[PDB]
Amino acid sequence: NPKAFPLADAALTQQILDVVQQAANLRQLKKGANEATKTLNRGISEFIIMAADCEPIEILLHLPLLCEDKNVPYVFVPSRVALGRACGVSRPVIAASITTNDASAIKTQIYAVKDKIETLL
Amino acid sequence: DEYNNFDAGDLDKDIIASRLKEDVAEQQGRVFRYFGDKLLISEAKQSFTRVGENNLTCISCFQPVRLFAYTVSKDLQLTKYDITDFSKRPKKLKYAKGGAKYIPTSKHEYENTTEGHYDEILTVAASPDGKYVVTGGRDRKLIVWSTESLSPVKVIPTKDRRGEVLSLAFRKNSDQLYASCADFKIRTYSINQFSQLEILYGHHDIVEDISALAMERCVTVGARDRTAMLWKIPDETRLTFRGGDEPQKLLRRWMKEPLFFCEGSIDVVSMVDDFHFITGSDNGNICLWSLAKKKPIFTERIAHGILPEPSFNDISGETDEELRKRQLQGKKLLQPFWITSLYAIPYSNVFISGSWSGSLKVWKISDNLRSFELLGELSGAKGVVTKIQVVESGKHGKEKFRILASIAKEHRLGRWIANVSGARNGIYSAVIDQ
Amino acid sequence: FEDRFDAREHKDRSNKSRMQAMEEYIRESSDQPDWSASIGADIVNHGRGGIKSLRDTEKERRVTSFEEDNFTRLNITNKAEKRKQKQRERNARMNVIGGEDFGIFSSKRKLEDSTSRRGAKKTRSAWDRAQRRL
Amino acid sequence: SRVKKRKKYQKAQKKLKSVRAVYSGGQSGVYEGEKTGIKKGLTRSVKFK
Amino acid sequence: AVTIRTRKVISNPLLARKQFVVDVLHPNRANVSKDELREKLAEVYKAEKDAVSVFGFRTQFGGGKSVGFGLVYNSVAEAKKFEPTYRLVRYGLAEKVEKASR
Amino acid sequence: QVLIDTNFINFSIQKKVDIVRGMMDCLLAKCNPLITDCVMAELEKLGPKYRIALKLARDPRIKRLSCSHKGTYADDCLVHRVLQHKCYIVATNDAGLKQRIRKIPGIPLMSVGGHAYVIEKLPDVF
Amino acid sequence: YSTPKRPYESSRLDAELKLAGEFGLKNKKEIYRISFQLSKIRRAARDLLTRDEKDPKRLFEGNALIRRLVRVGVLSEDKKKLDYVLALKVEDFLERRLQTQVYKLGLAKSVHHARVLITQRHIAVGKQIVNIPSFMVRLDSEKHIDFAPTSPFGGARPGRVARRNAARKAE
RNA sequence: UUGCCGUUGCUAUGGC
Ligand SMILES: [Zn+2]
C-alpha cells in the first residue's frame, strides 16, 4: 500500500478529467493544493482530485487527512501534466477540488463520478 | 447480372454528369504517389538551425505549381525564411514582432483592428498563390501579411471573448482559409476578397486542429470530446468519427494467452487523400480513418514511447530507497509521449509524426489502405515538435524532400512541459531523397 | 389467364416495412457515419418550431435537391397545404420533442408482422430450413 | 402571470422556514453561536410508534 | 463583404447559355442586392452583364446566406430572344403593358 | 413502495386486478408492494373462506416487512409507519383508514375503484 | 395537452407552485404540456415492459426509445435500461429547456433573467438566435448555448439605451 | 546558423 492509495485506473481517470474540464468551463473548479485545502475546510467541495506523481508526494498527502475528517471523496490521478491540461491552465496542477454548486448543469456527472470513487474507496 | 442491366434514371444522371462542368476541384483521388518504400531513410541530411526565439509555435511553407517558409513564436514574432536553397539552412528575410504596442485602447470586441499581435500567435498559413500569409492566436484576431512587404493589409477579428484561433488551413489551390476557433467554431474566410463566408459549429471541446485538401471538405478535431469531424462546407454537414479503444477489452485481447490503455484527447490531424485521414491522440495513438466507417481503420497504440519514470530521489522525501521505490506503484503511473504534430504529404504513402520523444517518426501506410508501418526515425530534433511539414522538388520519378519542422521546449498552447532534456528552439530540416 | 402490365406489381413502394425502430437500430449498428448537420442550422423558426424531425430533414433535402436539379420554386396550392402542412406541424408539435419523434412508441403497428419474419423465403420445409442454415 | 408566480414562490419558501428548519447551505464563516437561542426543554424529534 | 459562389455549372448551348446555382454569402448585410450581384457575376465570368440573369433568390433563416439560380449567356441578342418578358421588364429592356378591360 | 392491507387485497381479487401489474398500470412506474406481518396475520385470521387471498398475498414479487408490536392491528401499524417516514404509498379501501391517511399530509393513497386502481394524493401521475 | 384527473388537490397546487417558482415558468400549461408527453412516453415504456424478453417490439422499440431519450438529454449514458424510462419524471424534462439551461450555464443571474435574455434575443444556440424559452436543448446542443453575435452581451454594438446615453453625454 | 552568454569552426554543439 503506497501513499497515494486510491489510484483511479484508465476509465475512471478520463471520466474524472472530463468532469474536471467541464467544471472548469462552468467555473465550479478550484485548482491547486492550498486552494484545495481552503475549500475543503470551508465546505464548498464535493470531491477532490490529487495527482500521484508530484515532485514530493507529501505536499499533497496533507489532503486525505482533511478528507477523512470531513467525509469528502479523494482520488489520485496518475499525471499532473494531464491534470493541468484538464483544468485548462498553462501549468501542471497537482490538486483540484469541485466546489459545491446546486445550480449546476453537470450535477449528474459530478455525482456519478463521486459515487464511482466512493465505491473505489 | 443479366444481359440487360440499364436503368433509365441512371443513364439520365450520367448524361447530366457528362453535361456539367467543374471536373477540377472535386478530385476524389486516392493515394496515387505510392512512394513509401521507394525513398530511402537513414541518409537524410538533418540540419537543425537553432534560432533565437523562445518557443516557436508553427511553420507555414510554400511551393508554387523562389520558395519561402514562415515561422511564428510565443515571443510574438513571425519570421519569414527563404528555403529555396535546398541543401543549406533557411535564411531570415523579415522579422515581425508584435507586443504591447498593439493592445487596443478600447477593451471591446468589434474594434480589435490593431495592426499587430499582443499574445501568443498560434498558427500561420501561407497562401497557395503565395501573395499573403495569415496568422493568428489568443488575441482573437486573424492578421493577413503581404509577402513582399510583411505589412498587415487586413485585420479580421473573430469577435467573441474566447475567439482564440488554434489551427489554420488554406484549402489547396484556392484562396479560402479555414480557421478552427476555440469557441467550438470553424470560421471560413476568402482572403483575396477579405470576407467571411461561413461560420460553422459543432465540436464539443476546443477545436484544436484542422486540415484541408483539394475539395471544399475539411477535417477538424477537438480536444477532449475524442471525436474527429469532417465537414461539407457547401452542404454545411459533417461526419463524426469517435474513438473507441477500450483498455479492458484490449487487455482481454492480450489476455487470450501490456501497458496500453484508454484515450485522453485527440490532438492533431492531417488529411491524406479525399477518402482517409490520420489523427494523433493523447496516449500516443495514431489512427487511420476512412470515410465509410465511424471507428478508425487502424490504430497504432503507442507511437512515440513512454515518458521516463519519476526519480526515486524526487518522488517522496523519505530516507530509504525501498520506500521511495515503493512510492512509484510499479508501472501504474507511466504515461506516453503524446503525438503532438502530425503531417501528411498529400495523396502520398508516407506521413510524419513528432513529439518530445526526440526522434520524428516517418511512417508509410500500406498499399491496401488498411494499416501503416514505421519506416524510420529522425534523431536530430531534441524537443517538442510544434509543427511538421514537407517541401518537395523534382519530377515524378525522382524527387527530393526537406522536412521542415519546428522544435520548441514547451507545447504550443499551454506550457505543461517540464524535463527539457537539452532541447533547443529552432527549425529542423531533414532532406530525404529519391 | 393472360398478361397485364402493372406498375403496382413492379413499383418501389418500400414504405410498408420501413419502421423507425429498425432503421434506428441499423443506424446505430451500421459503422458508417450519418451526415449530421451543424448544430444550429437544424432548428427552424428561431425555435418556434421543433428542431426538425429526421423525416423532415430528408424530405427537405429532397425538396432543395429537386430545386437545385430542375430550377423551380414550389407553390401555395391551398388544398394540399391546408391539409398536409397544418397537419404536419400539428403532429410535429404533439409528438416531436427535442427533434426526436416519440409517436412511434404510441401507435399501433405490428413490427414483426410487416418488417421481420420473411414471407417468400418462409422455409416451409425442414429440408429447406436445413439447407438455408447451411 | 410569471412575476406573480415568481413572488408567490418567494413568499412560499419564506413560509417554509417557519414550519421546518430549512438547510441554508452550511456554516458561513466562523461559528458565532446559535444566534436565536438554545431551548433545553423542547425536543423536536419523531418518537417511534 | 458580399461574396459569391457558383455550383453545378452546366452548359445549355441549345439555348446558348450556361446555368448554375449561386450561394450568396453576405455577413451582417441586408440581403443580396440583385443588381450589384449581377455586376459581381458579370465580373467573375466573362462580362455579358445585360445577358446574365439571376432569379431564384431565397434567403435563409437568420441571414448569412442566400441560394439562387444564375444563368449566364453569351450574345445579348439571344438573351433578349430567350429570356422571358417578365424577367426582361424586371432587369433588362423589354416592356409590355396590356389593355386592361372587362 | 406500496403498503397494502387486507381489503385492498380482497377488492383486487374481487375485481380481478393483479397486484404488481395493477400498481404499475396505475402509477406508470415500478412498485414494491409490501405486506406487513399484521396485514398477513389479518389475512390468515380471516379464515379459510379467504385461502385464495392468502395464497395471492404469499407471492414472490410481494415483499414483506416485519412489524414489531404486540397484536395484529393493521390500521394502526400502517398509520404509524406511514407518518413515521413519509416515503410510502398506502393502498387501502377502508373508509376509516382512507380518512386517516388523507388527513395526514404528504402520503399518497391508492384504492381499488371501478376496474383498476386509482391514486389520490400523488401529484405526478401523468 | 390535457389537464390532470384531480387538478385542484392541495398537493398538486403545491407541486405546480414549486415547479413554476423553481424553473421560472409562466403558467400551468407548460407543466401540463410537458407532463402530457411524458405520460405518453412512460405509458409506452410500461407496455414495452409488459411484453417479455426477446420480443421484436420490446427489443427494437426499447433500444430506440432509450437511445433517443439519451439523445434528447433526459436520460444518462449509463442507464441503458427500460425501467429508468419509467423512473423518469417532469423536472428532468423541464430541466432541459433553454431558460433553465441558460440559468445553469451562468449566462444569467436568475431563471427570470434567463427568460428575458432569451425572449429579447441574446441567446443563440448554435447558429440561430432562439427567442422562446421552452426549447428542450439536446445533449449535443448543450454546450453551444452562448451569447448571440448580434448581442451587446456578446461582441456587438451597444443597445439603444447605452448609445442614446452616449449621445446625451456627447451633447 | 540568435536573445544572449560558452565550447568556438578560421563549422557543429550546451546552458539559461
Ligand atoms: Zn403491524
C-alpha cell at G17: 407552485
Q: Edge-to-edge strands of the sheet including A95-98?
A: A29-31, A95-98, A48-51, A74-77
Can you name the residues that pair with B319 across neighbouring β-strands? none
Between CA F12 and CA F20 the distance in angstroms is 11
A32 torsion bin: left (phi>0), alpha (psi -120 to 50), beta (else)? left
Enumerate residues 6+ apart whose C-beta is below 8 A from F103: none
* Protein residue closest via CA to C1' of H13: B50
Partners of B306 in the β-ladder: B336
Q: Return d(Cα F111, Cα F23) in angstroms, integer.
A: 10
Which positions ≥6 away from C118 have C-beta within 8 Å? Answer: none
Instruction: Indicate the SS3 state at residue G161.
Output: helix
Could you tell me the strand order of the sheet in which B165-170 lies?
B165-170, B176-181, B185-190, B195-201
Contact B201 G156 (CB under 8 A): no
B148 burial level (CB within 10 Å; 0-12, 13-18, 19+)? exposed
Please report how the helices D12-19 and D2-10 are oriented relative to each other, as an axis angle in degrees rounded to 10: 20
Among C46, C68, C73, select the one facing E21 at the smallest CB separation: C68
Residues of E with CB under 8 A from a CB of G: 61-62, 64
Q: How far apart are CA B128 and CA B168, in angstroms?
A: 13
What is the Cα–Cα distance from A101 to A27, expressed in whole angstroms?
Answer: 10
Angle at C103 between CA G80 and CA B239, to 5 degrees: 60
Residue F92: all three cell numbers together: 387501502
Q: In Å, how far is D48's CA from the nearest CA of chain F?
A: 7
SS3 F117: strand
Q: Which helix (H) or strand (E) holds E71?
A: strand E64-73
How many Cβ atoms are within 10 Å of B47's Cβ, its own excluded? 16
Contacts of B234 (CB under 8 A, 6+ apart): B216, E5, E7, E23
Q: Which of residues 39-78 of G touch A (CB under 8 A)?
A: 76, 78
Amino acid at C47: G
Task: Name the DSSP class of C105.
Answer: G
Q: In B62-85, which positions are buried (b, 16+ CB within 10 angstroms) versus exposed (e)?
A: beeeebbbbbbbbbbbbbbbebee
d(CA B196, CA C34): 28
* CB-based contacts of F66, cutoff 8 Å, min separation 6: F36, F37
Name the helix (H) or strand (E) containing F91.
Answer: strand F89-91
Q: What is the resolution of this structure in A?
A: 3.4
Per the structure block, which three cell numbers stand in for A29? 473548479
- CA F2 to mean position of chain CA atoms: 6
Sheet containing B68-73: which strands, arranged edge to edge? B56-60, B68-73, B77-82, B91-97
The alpha carbon of B117 is separated from its chain's Cα centroid by a whole number of angstroms, namely: 22
Four-point Cα dihedral B175, B180, B184, B190, nearest 10: -20
Measuring from the CA of residue B427 to each C1' atom, give the nucleotide at the shortest distance.
H1
* Nearest C-alpha in G relative to B160: G155
Phi, psi dihedral angles at C3 (to 5 degrees): -90, 130
Chain C residues whose C-beta sits inside 8 Å of any chain E C-beta: 44-46, 64, 68, 71, 73
Cβ separation G48–C105 shorter than 8 A: yes
CB under 7 Å from strand H: B 47-53, 89, 92, 380, 420, 422, 424
Residue of C nearest to G74 (CA): C98
Separation CA B145–CA B71 (nearest Å): 13
CB contacts of E25 in chain G (<8 Å) are none
**How far, in Å, CA of B217 to CA of B239, rounded?**
11
Whether C and G touch (3+ CB pairs < 8 Å), yes or no: yes
Dist CA B113 CA B102 (whole Å): 9
Of the candidates G93, G97, G103, G67, the one whose C-alpha atom is nearest the C-alpha of residue G82 is G67
Chain C closest-CA separation from residue B231 CA (Å): 9
Task: Pick out the nucleotide with least CA–C1' distance to B48.
Answer: H1
Domain coordinates of chain A in residue numbers?
A: 1-121
C-alpha cell at B111: 474594434
Task: Tell me how far CA of residue D32 lies from CA of A70, D29, D37, in angstroms.
Answer: 20, 8, 12
CATH number 3.30.460.30 is the correct assignment for the domain at A1-121: no
Name the grid cell of B312. Answer: 526515486
How many angstroms away from the CA of F25 is the closest CA of chain D? 33
Q: Are B61 and B125 in contact (CB under 8 A)?
A: no
For residue C101, give the H/E element and its range: strand C100-101
Give the DSSP H/E element, type plus range, for residue E43: helix E34-44
**Interior angle at CA B306, CA B301 and CA B309, nearest 5:** 150
The one-letter amino acid at C112 = E
Does the beta-carbon distance from A78 to B264 stay under 8 Å? no
Q: What are phi and psi of C115, to 5 degrees?
A: -100, -50
Within 7 Å of a protein beta carbon, the nucleotides of strand H are 1-4, 12-16
DSSP assigned state of A2? -
State the Cα angle at C119 between C115 and C125, rounded to 5°.
140
Instruction: Identify the DSSP state of C76.
Output: -
Nearest-angstrom CA–CA distance, A55 and B315: 5
Say if strands C100-101 and C96-97 run parallel, antiparallel, or are unpaired: antiparallel
For residues E9 and B22, the answer to whether their CB atoms sit within 8 Å is yes
Q: At A48, give phi and psi (nearest 5°).
A: -130, 135
Pairing state between β F109-113 and F89-91: parallel
3-state secondary structure chain B: CCCCCCCHHHHHHHHHHHHECCCCCCCCCCCCECCCCCCCCCCCEEEEEECCCCCEEEEECCCCCCCEEEEEECCCEEEEEECCCCCCCCEEEEEEECCHHHCCCCCCCCCCCCCCCCCCEEEEEECCCCCEEEEEECCCEEEEEECCCCCEEEEEECCCCCCCEEEEEECCCCCEEEEEECCCEEEEEECCCCEEEEEEECCCCCEEEEEECCCCEEEEEECCCCEEEEEECCCCEEEEEECCCCHHHHHHHHCCCCCCCCCCCCCEEEECCCCCEEEECCCCCEEEECCCCCCCCEEECCCCCECCCCCHHHCCCCCCHHHHHHCCCHHHHCCECCCCEEEECCCECEEEEECCCCCEEEEEECCCCCCEEEEEEECCCCCEEEEEEEEEECCCCCCEEEEEEEEECCCCCCCCCCCCCCCCCEEEEEEEEC
Q: In what order do the strands lie in the sheet with B141-146?
A: B121-126, B132-137, B141-146, B152-157
Q: What share of chain G is helix, strand, coil (3-state, %, to 5)?
A: 50, 5, 45
C-alpha separations of A87 from A35, A84, B409, E74, F11 in Å: 14, 5, 21, 62, 61
Q: Give the C-alpha separation, D27 to A42, whole Å.
A: 8
Q: Rounded to whole angstroms, how far apart are CA atoms B259 and B332?
A: 9
Instruction: Kindly state the cell numbers that stand for E1.
Output: 463583404
Shortest Cα–Cα distance, B40 to chain C (Å): 37
- Please, what is the end-to-end C-alpha distance for chain B in angstroms? 46
3-class DSSP assignment, residue A14: helix
Residue E11 grid cell? 452548359
In total, how many domains does chain G have? 1
CB of B236 within 8 Å of any CB in chain C? yes
Pair B432, B41: CB distance under 8 Å = yes
* G131 and chain E in contact, CB less than 8 A: no
Q: Is E70 helix (H, G, I), strand (E, B) or coil?
A: strand
Three-class DSSP category at F98: helix
Angle between helices F74-83 and F37-45 (to 10 degrees): 160
Give the domain range for residue G104.
Answer: 7-171
C-alpha angle A31/A34/A35, rounded to 5°? 40
Task: Tell me if G41 is assigned to some domain.
Answer: yes
Q: What is the DSSP letter of A7?
A: B
Helix (H, G, I), strand (E, B) or coil at E22: strand
E76, E83 in Cβ contact below 8 A? no
Beta-bridged to residue B187, according to DSSP, are B179, B199
- In total, chain F counts a number of residues equal to 126
Closest by Cα among B368, B355, B370, B350 to B287: B370
Adjacent-strand bridge partners of B170 = B177
What angle do helix axes F95-103 and F74-83 make, rounded to 10 degrees?
10
Q: How far is the CA of E77 from the centre of ligand 1 (A)?
A: 103
Task: Give me the residues paired with residue A9 across strands.
Answer: none
- Residue B39 carries which side chain, given as an amino acid letter? L
Distance CA C68, CA C51 (A): 24
Residue entry with cell 383508514: F97
- At G49, give phi and psi (nearest 5°): -80, -30
Q: How many Cβ atoms sit within 10 Å of the Cβ of residue G142?
A: 18
D35 vs D31: CA distance, rounded Å: 10
Judging by DSSP bridges, how do beta strands B341-344 and B298-300 pair with one another? unpaired
The set of cell numbers assigned to E81 is 430572344
Contacts of C48 in chain G (CB under 8 A): 131-132
Touching A (3+ Cβ pairs <8 A), the chains are B, G
Angle (nearest 5°) at CA B270 between B266 and B272: 130
Domain boundaries, chain E: 3-102
**Contact B183/G157, CB-based, under 8 Å?**
no
Residue G93 lies in a domain: yes
- Residue A105 corresponds to which cell in the numbers above? 448543469
Give Cα separations from C43 to A73, B186, C54, G141 (angstroms): 41, 19, 12, 11
HSE-up of D5 (CA within 13 Å, CB side)? 20
Is-contact E69 E56, C-beta < 8 A?
yes
Return the closest-CA partner of residue B336 out of B422, B246, B247, B259.
B259
- Strand F33-35 to F2-4 pairing: parallel
F67 and F77 Cβ atoms separated by less than 8 Å: yes
Which CATH class for the E3-102 domain? alpha beta
C-alpha separations of B274 from B215, B289, B433, F38 in Å:
8, 11, 26, 76
Contact partners of D by the rule of 3+ C-beta pairs under 8 A?
Answer: F, G
Mark residue B202 as left, alpha or beta (left: phi above 0; alpha: psi -120 to 50; beta: remaining): left
DSSP string over D1-49: -HHHHHHHHHTHHHHHHHHS----SS--SS----SS---SS--------
What are phi and psi for residue G77, nearest 5 degrees? Answer: -70, -30
Cell numbers placing B382 = 531534441
Nearest CA in chain D to F78: D49
Query: Looking at this protein, which amino acid is placed at residue B201?
Result: Y
Q: Which long-range contacts (CB under 8 A, 24 or more apart) does F63-70 make?
A: F63/F32, F63/F33, F63/F34, F63/F35, F64/F34, F64/F35, F64/F36, F64/F37, F64/F40, F65/F3, F65/F34, F65/F35, F65/F36, F65/F37, F66/F36, F66/F37, F67/F36, F67/F37, F67/F38, F69/D49, F69/F38
List the helix and strand counts (H, then E) for chain A.
Answer: 6, 4
Closest residue in G to F108 (Cα) is: G11
Q: Is residue G2 assigned to a domain?
A: no
Give Cβ neighbours of residue B172 (< 8 Å, ≥ 6 apart): B128, B212, B213, B214, B346
Task: Work out the burial of residue G161: count CB atoms within 10 Å of its CB; fewer than 13 is exposed, 13-18 middle, 19 or more buried.
Answer: exposed
- How far apart (Å, rounded) are the C-alpha atoms in residues B262 and E54? 55
Cross-chain Cβ contact D46/F69 below 8 Å: no
Rounded Cα–Cα distance for residues B382 and B358 (Å): 5
Cross-chain CB nearest to G105 (options A26, A108, A112): A26
Tell the burial category of G165 from Cβ atoms under 10 Å away from its Cβ (0-12, 13-18, 19+): exposed
* G142 to A105: CB separation less than 8 angstroms, yes or no: yes
Q: How many CB atoms lie within 10 A of CB G102?
A: 28
Please give the protein residue whose CA is closest to the C1' of the nucleotide H14: B422
